[PDB]
Design a protein around this ligand. Structure first.
Ligand SMILES: N[C@@H](Cc1ccc(O)cc1)C(=O)O
Ligand SMILES: [Mg+2]
Length: 215
């Protein structure tokens, strides 16, 4: 009735997913009978999204057709930070690549119902002190559990320290968006849980994390 019953939405949402960190909390959010904020983030370095993102985008469409609010999030903030004088992305590259992603995903999603946002929109105004505050919320040993970090460390390959900050940027993005749900590939599990974790540390209701296989 304007919004499908919560248990039916659940059945449609979980079809084709590998994991949902807290079915219990997703049901609780759906029973609130309100538009949920759906976060899906993309790295703007590639020329396009490959044909394996399809399940992911059709899951965002499922959320959109159930009345929920999808934020298409471009993570330009970290991509544009260079080395103190290999170049980073320029703003013109971010904008050009982002336009191509939108031409793609709006063959599926509705543009009048989708929010396109760039995480530099809030992070460009964060101070070093705001990032030190964020960095105090996770430990070194927890960051070293991310599978790619664990392999590099075990093979004594260098891990620059700012690479530990990148998951914290992604987590904070959930806070600034007030994400109810975040979607990603099964490879991005660690990073999606970062936002759920950091939301609690900041006194926010935590997001549900949903992974789909990225073919
Ligand atoms: N870091 C993610 C992309 C991303 C960026 C910012 C976010 O808030 C969320 C996701 C990746 O490597 O694909
Ligand atoms: Mg923006």
């Amino acid at each position: 009735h304007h919004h499908l019953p919560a248990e039916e939405q659940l059945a449609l949402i979980q079809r084709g997913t590998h994991e949902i960190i807290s079915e219990e909390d997703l049901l609780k959010k759906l029973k609130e009978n309100r538009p949920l904020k759906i976060k899906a983030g993309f790295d703007p370095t590639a020329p396009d999204l490959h044909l394996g993102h399809t399940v992911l985008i059709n899951k965002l469409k499922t959320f959109q057709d159930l009345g929920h609010e999808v934020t298409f999030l471009i993570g330009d903030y970290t991509a544009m930070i260079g080395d103190p004088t290999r170049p980073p992305l320029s703003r013109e590259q971010v904008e050009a690549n982002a336009k191509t992603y939108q031409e793609q995903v709006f063959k599926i999603l509705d543009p009048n119902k989708t929010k396109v946002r760039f995480n530099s929109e809030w992070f460009n105004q964060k101070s070093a002190a705001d990032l030190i505050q964020l960095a105090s919320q996770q430990t070194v040993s927890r960051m070293l559990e991310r599978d790619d970090f664990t392999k590099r460390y075990n093979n004594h390959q260098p891990i620059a320290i700012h690479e530990f900050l990148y998951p914290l940027v992604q987590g904070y993005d959930s806070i600034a968006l007030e994400a109810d749900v975040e979607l990603g590939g099964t490879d991005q599990t660690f990073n999606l849980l970062m936002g759920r974790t950091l939301q609690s540390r900041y006194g926010q209701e935590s997001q549900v994390c949903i992974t789909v296989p990225i073919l």
